[PDB]
Symmetry: C3
Subunit: 256 residues, 3 copies
Amino acid sequence: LIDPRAIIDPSARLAADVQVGPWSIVGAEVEIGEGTVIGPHVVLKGPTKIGKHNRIYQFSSVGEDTPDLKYKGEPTRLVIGDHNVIREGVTIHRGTVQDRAETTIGDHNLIMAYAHIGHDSVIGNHCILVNNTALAGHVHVDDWAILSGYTLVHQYCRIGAHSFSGMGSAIGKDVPAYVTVFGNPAEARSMNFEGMRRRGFSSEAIHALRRAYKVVYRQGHTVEEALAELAESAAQFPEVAVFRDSIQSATRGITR
Amino acid sequence: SLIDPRAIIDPSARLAADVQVGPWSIVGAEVEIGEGTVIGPHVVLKGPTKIGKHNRIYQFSSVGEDTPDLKYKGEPTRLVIGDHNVIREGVTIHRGTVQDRAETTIGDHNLIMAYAHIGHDSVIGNHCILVNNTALAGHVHVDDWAILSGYTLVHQYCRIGAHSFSGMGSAIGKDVPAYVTVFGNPAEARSMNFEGMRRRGFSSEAIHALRRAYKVVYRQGHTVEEALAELAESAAQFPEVAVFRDSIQSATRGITR
Amino acid sequence: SLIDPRAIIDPSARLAADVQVGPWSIVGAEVEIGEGTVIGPHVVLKGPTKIGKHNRIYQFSSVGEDTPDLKYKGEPTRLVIGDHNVIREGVTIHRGTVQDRAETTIGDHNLIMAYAHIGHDSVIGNHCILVNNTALAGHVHVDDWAILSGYTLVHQYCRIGAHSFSGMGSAIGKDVPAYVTVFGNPAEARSMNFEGMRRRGFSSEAIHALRRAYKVVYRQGHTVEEALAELAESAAQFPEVAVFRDSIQSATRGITR
Ligand SMILES: CC1(C)CN([C@]2(C(=O)Nc3nnn[nH]3)CN(C(=O)c3cccc(C(F)(F)F)c3)c3ccccc32)C(=O)O1
Ligand SMILES: CC1(C)CN([C@]2(C(=O)Nc3nnn[nH]3)CN(C(=O)c3cccc(C(F)(F)F)c3)c3ccccc32)C(=O)O1
Ligand SMILES: CC1(C)CN([C@]2(C(=O)Nc3nnn[nH]3)CN(C(=O)c3cccc(C(F)(F)F)c3)c3ccccc32)C(=O)O1
Ligand SMILES: CC1(C)CN([C@]2(C(=O)Nc3nnn[nH]3)CN(C(=O)c3cccc(C(F)(F)F)c3)c3ccccc32)C(=O)O1
C-alpha cells in the first residue's frame, strides 16, 4: 500500500488504506485520509490536510510554499476535502498570513494536468479546472464552476457557482454565478443554461435566471438598480439568490 | 539495450532490441516498445500501448494515461505510436475511449515539444510539430507536416490540415484547411504556409495554384459548394491543390475563416 | 549527508562542499554547482552547465537539455546560471546553439516560476521575474528587472527591455522597449511601468523625462530614425532615457506598438 521506494516523514499521519506510489515524498505535517491514492513521483509538503478517496497523479507538487515575495516561511496550511482528482503535474501552494493562512479545496473537484492553484485560493465542490488553468492567489471558485483550458485568473477574483470560462480566457473581474465568459480580457457572453439543465433546475428557475441576466447586463441598470430589481425574484427562487448574492459580493466590479 | 535497474518493468511489458529505459521510469502492463526506442528517466508509460522504433521519450512525460473526462473508464482502449518520434519533457498523451475510436494514434517523424497534450482519440499523422504547451482536447486529427505553434489550443473534433500553421496562443474551434495559416483566440485564417511549401520543395506552379485556391475559398463570397466546383480544374492539374480541396470538402462543421 | 544517496552525481560533476542534492536527482557530466545551491528532488541537470551560488532548483525541472530545434546537431554548447536564482517546479532551460554564441545565460536574483521555458541562446539579466508558463522561443534577451506575467509567449530574437512588464497571456513578436508595459495577443504597448519605477527609487525627474520619451517614439508620428534623434538630448540628462533610447536602437524586429 505504501511503496517502499516512497519517503514518508515520521510526523506524517496516513489512514489505513492510503496508497503511496514509488519515489513520492510525504513530508512533515501531511495528513492523508482513508481511500486516498497518491501516485508515483508526487511531492506533498505541509502543513497540509488531505481528505478521503482523493487521487493525486505523478509530477504534482501539493503544498509547496508560494514564491510570492510577501511569503516569509510562516506555518500556513492547505486543506483538500474528499473525492478530488488532481491530475499530472498540478501545483497547489499553501496560504499566506496576510490572508487567513490557508488554501482550501472542497469535494468532487477535477483539477486537470498542470493546473495551478495559488496561495489562499478557495475552491468549493464539483468544480472542473481544465488543463493549465492558473489561479494567481486569493481566488474563490464557487461550486459547479468550469474553467476551460489555459484559463488565467487574476488575484482576488471570485468565480461564481455554475459559471463557465472559455479556453484561454484571462479573468480580471468577478464572474457572477451561471455567467459564461470568453477571451483575454474575459467578457460576459451569456448564462450557462447547459450547466443548469445538467442539474435539473426547474424550467421556471431557468426562465427566472434568464430574466435576472437581462436585469443586470442588458437594461442600462447600475449594479444597485439591478440588485434592487432582483430582490423579489431572489426571495422567490433560491437559484436567483445565488446570482443576486454573487453580484452583491463583487464590489471589485463584475465581468462585462 | 540498457534497462536501468531503478526502472519498474511490468512482466507483461515487451521491449525489443536496443530499447533503453532510464532510472525511475515505469513501463506498465501491456506496453510494447519497438527497436532502438529510448525512454528517459522519470517517464510513466501505461498500456495497452504500442510504441514503434527509434522513438525518444523525455523525462516527466505520462504516455498512455486514461482521460480524466470519463469518471468510469472503459477498457481496453489503446495508444499507438509509430517510428522516429520525439516526445519532449512533460508531454501527456491519453489513450482512446470506448465510446469512439478506442485508440489515440501517432504516426512517424513527429516532434511533440514540452508540456504538449494529446487528448483521447486524437490522430496525428507524420512529420508534424506540436510546439510547447499545444493542447488537443480530444478527437483531433492532425494531418502530415502540420505545425501547431506554442500554446495552441484545439477544441474536440477539429481537423488540422496537412502543411497548415497555427500561430502561438491560437485557439482553434473549426477545421483548419490544408496549407492555411491561422492566428488568434478565436483563430482566424490569415494566408497560406508558402514558407513550408518552399521548404518541402513544391514547384512555383503548385505554389501559384495554391495562392489562387485560397482566394477562391476565402475572398470571393462563394458557398463551399461553389468554391469546390471552382477548384475542380486546379485540383485535377495539381495533387497539392486536391489536398486543399479535400480538406475543405471533408469539413462538414465549417472551416476557420 | 548533503548529496542524497538516491541522487546520481556524474564523476565529471564539480559540486562545492555545502551543495545539497535531493533524492532521484541527476547531476550529469560537466555540470558545475556553486556553494549554497540547493537542488531539489526529481531534478535533471545536464551539461556542459555552470550553476552559481545560493541557487534553488525545485522538482521536475530539466536544466541543460539540448533544444529540439532542428538546427542544433549535437555540438558542444553550454548554459550558465548566476547566483541567488529561484527556479520553480517543472522549468525547462535549454543550452545554446553554435549559430549564436553557443550559450544560454541567466544572471542573478531571478525568479523563474513553475513550467516557464527558457529556449536556446536566451540571455536573462538580474532581478527578472518569469511567471508560470512564460516561454522564450530562443535567442530572447530579457534585461534587468523585467517581469513577464503568466503564460507570456516570446518569439525568437525578441528583446525584453529593463523594468518592462507583460500582462498575463501576452504574445510578444516585436521588441519590448525598456520601462514599457505590453498586453494581449498580439502584444500592444500600453504606456510605461511607472509603478515599478516609483517603487524602484527612480527620481521624479527621470519618470517625467521617460513620459516625454514615450510620446516621442509612440505618439508623434516619428520613425525610429526620427525619434532616436529627438531622444539624444534627454538621453544625456538621464541614464533612464538612455536605457530606453538604447532598447529602441537595438530592436532588430521593430518595436511593439
Ligand atoms: C466535448 C467538448 C464540447 C468539450 N470541450 C472542452 C472545451 O474546452 N470546450 C471549450 N472551452 N472553451 N471554449 N470551448 C474541452 N474540455 C477539456 O477538458 C480539455 C482537455 C484538454 C485540453 C483542453 C484545451 F484544449 F482547452 F486546452 C480542454 C472541456 C471541459 C469542460 C467543458 C468543455 C470542455 C471541447 O473541446 O469539446
Ligand atoms: C463530457 C460529459 C459526459 C461530462 N461532463 C462534464 C461534467 O461536469 N459532468 C458532471 N456533471 N455533474 N457531475 N459530473 C462537464 N464537462 C464538459 O466537458 C462540458 C461539455 C459541454 C458543455 C459544458 C458546459 F456546461 F460547461 F457548457 C461542459 C466535463 C469535462 C470533464 C469531465 C466531466 C465533465 C458533461 O457535462 O458531459
Ligand atoms: C525562428 C522562428 C522564425 C520560428 N519560431 C517559432 C514560433 O513560435 N513561430 C511563431 N509562432 N507563432 N507565430 N510565429 C517558435 N518555435 C518553437 O518551437 C518554440 C519553442 C518554445 C516556445 C515557443 C513559443 F514561444 F511559441 F511558445 C516556440 C517554432 C516552431 C515551428 C515553427 C515556428 C516556430 C520563432 O519564434 O522564430
Ligand atoms: C498582486 C497582483 C496585483 C499581482 N498579480 C500578478 C499578475 O500576474 N498580474 C497581472 N498580470 N497581467 N495583468 N496583471 C500575479 N502574479 C503571479 O506571479 C502569478 C502567479 C501564478 C499565476 C499567475 C497567472 F495566473 F497569471 F499565471 C500569476 C504576479 C507577478 C508579478 C507581478 C504581478 C503579478 C495579480 O494577479 O495580483
